[PDB]
């Protein structure tokens, strides 16, 4: 590696931390000052913001690691907890996003059947169920020592995932294959319904389809490269015939992909809170 | 830091709050329809297809409606009209045969459509007493013959051209005289569209 | 017609698991807290339990926690007390008092009728010295009840109550919060006093007043009664 | 119908009034005499404020 | 003939005017800037709040909203005491009995329904329903536990008799809707505010108009007696409160500001009679010095129209209700 590229990564991490912190704190302040929540939209929309705030705390450790010339000035306990926090944050975000998607499908493609299926209590129950299932699934790494004392450096392995399990691989494959399909469908169907003729306002239709395309593009970019890479790398890394240049390009790709997945944390509050006209009035009030 | 009695009072207040929340969630998923008219317009036929305010309830395809009918409340409208802001729709009525002058009907439509508190609510206009209009036209600044097919279209145009906010406001129109169990379908469709418009917002979608 | 009838008495062997029921009638039973005050045969009252309106605030006294359980049958308007391991010291009459708590309410206003039970063989202290007072129907009796901890709470209330059990009947409320007069009680009775010092005053006494007077505190659970002050002649 | 208006208006005529100066003086005298008992006018210490916290 | 009657009424009213209240009261010291801070926020309702009334013990209050509920609040602790469901969701008025046993609630159903708060049954039950009005019921006030004064949209105010349910008297002098009702401190006279841009001085004992007060230019929306019992204040739709005089049959002074265009929805007084609160549609209430006519403060805390306003009997707090379901207890 080189110092300049490392400084680039550190600069991005600092900027991302700043944006994530400010955006998610403002989002939770808005949600608390809008505690009405008569519909199950705000339940998911707040749980996602809580997951993003939990996300915020992880980033400074990576910032320190990058800036401190690829060195880890923290303990084994912290190294073991950071990976758990990061892998709980990413999948909790994924599943709350796909629950947002499913709710938006039920609310616009079946407006009248869902009237008895969109109670604000099933939202909390399902969201807590997802929380607990993710916690159970990510219990394993919470007792896995991560020590690489090469020489002063103990390399925090479960920060830029490098090792292989292949059952972690099948687990992540089955854990991502469902949200991807659900979020692609629930939105393609909403596009089809909103385009094939309604007496709804035209401008509102155009804005809705534009926003759906933007949201699905962000979801498809800030999450698919990571899984695709992880899979192809691990099925390609520990095979006899890997060169050093192959190793360095794989390392760089892993860096960029994990960085991308971190990005969402900052991108998400903007899209799901500020752009919405549901409480633009309150947002302007704080101006 | 509270007496026993104060704690029991707090528990009672929390139970009151829980019941209020449950009732609000129950009553926020029911469609409310103000129902204006013009007198002899024929509101009776609509109300029987399904001193003060009058209220009706019916259920169609797992949906619960409530048709308030102000009707015979003879007082200033500007004083109590704002109580009905937020109704899902407005079932205006008018009789074709009354061309009792239709100028009063059109003035009332102009006041209701072109009003604050209602600048975003769809108006499900009805056109009842079709048959008697047809027989009367058969014998009895309008260009065109005295025929039903084009006269009905001209009347629809005259009523629809009083909406200055020609965009963002929808005014459905439907003819009916035999009450052939269709007048609930029209209302159901317009209510579906208003529900979807209210679901695009609130879902932050936007 | 606000009757409140009980059933479940009899003679029980030691260690038993008997169960009592109290059928409400003619009031909104679902919004009243319910207690289970008792009374040993030749003794004074003693609070036993409490289940709030909208169950889930159950309390018990000592000597019952773990062996008694109270349950509320809301839809059928019925109240249960489920006992276990009954010792010979549990024999007493059992009452079914109601109470409702909100700003300005009068708890303990209607009592049940009774259930003769004969099993086979940091609290607050309230003192009612000078029992068995003899008086003529003329006038001017003054019953005195004294406490240990001051009952004048910081908000302003003085949670002290008075009850009267005429010979052969069930107790009824007279004075709640030390100065307020319960409904249906003639204006002869008056209560007054300061912290740790109270005195019920009866003027123009007549025949119907003869009985026993009990003073009770409601500052903190467990609610504790006094010894009683019987009135004679 | 107009007759009743006539009697009402003539009864209105039948009343007697006081000078505006005296009425204003009475109003201000009452207000200044009761001034000290207006917690909204002169704020009270936080000791006798039930609503603080 | 009546034309010269009203002309000579004007002549006598002017002849009894010799000095403006402002000229007399200029020399008094101004009240100074007014501190007001929201001490409590009562948050139970789910729709627009339309009226409220303070209990006579200065601690309990009742509010009425369009979700078909009356709620009895304990203002010191913001607790809920009672929640009364209604048969008609369209309410426009509310009142608290001076004894504290009954509350009333009218609306668009034309019926003044009186409720019973202290029953052996344990709940609140409709003691009676008063019928006989042909238009929406706008205001209702209690004289005692067995009498009540209502004010409806059928142009008439009527005095009832709760036991029998009949109408003891009917007051018929307006020519437009009547939207406001005010009761004298001794409960022998009362005034009402109608959409004629006028207000009248009734007489409970014999039921006949005594003085007709005019000078506004639009629909009077609220009215309130001066605590002395010799003056009252009215709020209208032309952004202008006024203070009239009973003993002089005249208007005394006007409270208008060039930056105020919206309409007044409620007025009241302070215990001594120096301030004059007034709700507005600007979403905010104002405090007017009642002699200098100069403003003395603003109460900006509501996110929608202010629809009701009341000052406790001991003059220690102020309550405002708005179309966002939120009652605020200022101080």
Author numbering:
A (entry chain A): 54 to 340
B (entry chain C): 4 to 53, 182 to 230, 241 to 281, 289 to 354
C (entry chain S): 1 to 121, 124 to 235
D (entry chain G): 11 to 63
E (entry chain B): 10 to 340
What does the paper say about this structure?
GPR17 is a class A orphan G protein‐coupled receptor (GPCR) expressed in neurons and oligodendrocyte progenitors of the central nervous system (CNS). The signalling of GPR17 occurs through the heterotrimeric Gi, but its activation mechanism is unclear. GPR17 is a class A orphan G protein‐coupled receptor (GPCR), which is phylogenetically related to the families of purine P2Y receptors and cysteinyl leukotriene (CysLT) receptors. Specifically, under normal physiological conditions, GPR17 acts as a regulator of oligodendrocyte differentiation and maturation.
15 In this study, we employed cryo‐electron microscopy (cryo‐EM) to resolve the structure of active GPR17‐Gi complex in the absence of ligand and unexpectedly found that the GPR17 is a self‐activated receptor as well. The structure revealed the extracellular domains, transmembrane regions, and extracellular domains in complex with Gαi, Gβ, Gγ, and scFv16 at a resolution of 3.02 Å. However, in the GPR17 map, the whole N‐terminal residues (1‐54) were not resolved, indicating a highly flexible N‐term extracellular domain. The overall GPR17 ECL2 conformation is a hairpin like structure connected to a loop that inserts into the canonical ligand binding pocket, which is quite similar to the predicted structure in AlphaFold database. The central loop (P3 segment) is connected to TM5, which is immersed in the orthosteric pocket of GPR17. In addition, the conserved disulfide bond between C209 (ECL2) and C1323.25 (TM3) provides additional support to stabilize ECL2 in the position. The residues Y213 and R214 of the P3 segment interact with TM7 residues R3087.36 and N3077.35 to form hydrogen bonds, which help to lock the receptor in the active conformation. As shown in the cAMP assays, mutations of C209, Y213, and R214 of ECL2 greatly reduced the constitutive Gi‐mediated cAMP signaling, which indicates the hydrogen bond formed between ECL2 and TM7 is essential for GPR17‐basal activity. R1573.50 on TM3 rotates and interacts with Y2405.58 of receptor and C351 of Gαi to maintain TM5 and Gi in the position via hydrogen bonds. Interestingly, there is also a salt bridge between E318 on Gαi and R252 of ICL3 on GPR17, indicating a critical binding site of GPR17 to Gi.
